[PDB]
Design a binder for this molecule. Structure first.
Ligand SMILES: O=C(O)c1cc(S)ccc1[N+](=O)[O-]
Ligand SMILES: O=C(O)c1cc(S)ccc1[N+](=O)[O-]
Length: 84
């Protein structure tokens, strides 16, 4: 129901924190981004934030779609942690 982009900055920075390291790359793969497209975000100061801002532009970029993507890369631990 809720668009990712509509979440308060405070929630989005929790999401971003948990997607640190290479997790954002794994997630981006699941969201349908090609390797070189992903590599293009490494030029940003905040690659995770840049990715999700781009992804979040679509109308099907809901929190639940994001959460679904995370379960699929076997990172339900992040879903559990955010739902806590
Ligand atoms: O700690 C990070 O990995 C992080 C980095 C940048 S550039 C922006 C937001 C962040 N948050 O919020 O996690
Ligand atoms: O709306 C919420 O508080 C929220 C709930 C769940 S289950 C997961 C992530 C969330 N984030 O990130 O906002």
């Amino acid at each position: 129901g809720n668009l990712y982009s509509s979440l308060p900055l405070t929630k989005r920075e929790e999401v971003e924190k948990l997607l640190n390291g290479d997790t954002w790359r794994h997630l981006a793969g699941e969201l349908g981004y090609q390797p070189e497209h992903i590599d293009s975000f490494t030029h940003e100061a905040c690659p995770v934030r840049a990715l999700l801002a781009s992804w979040g532009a679509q109308d099907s970029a809901t929190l639940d779609a994001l959460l679904a993507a995370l379960r699929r890369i076997q990172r339900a631990d992040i879903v559990e942690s955010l739902c806590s």
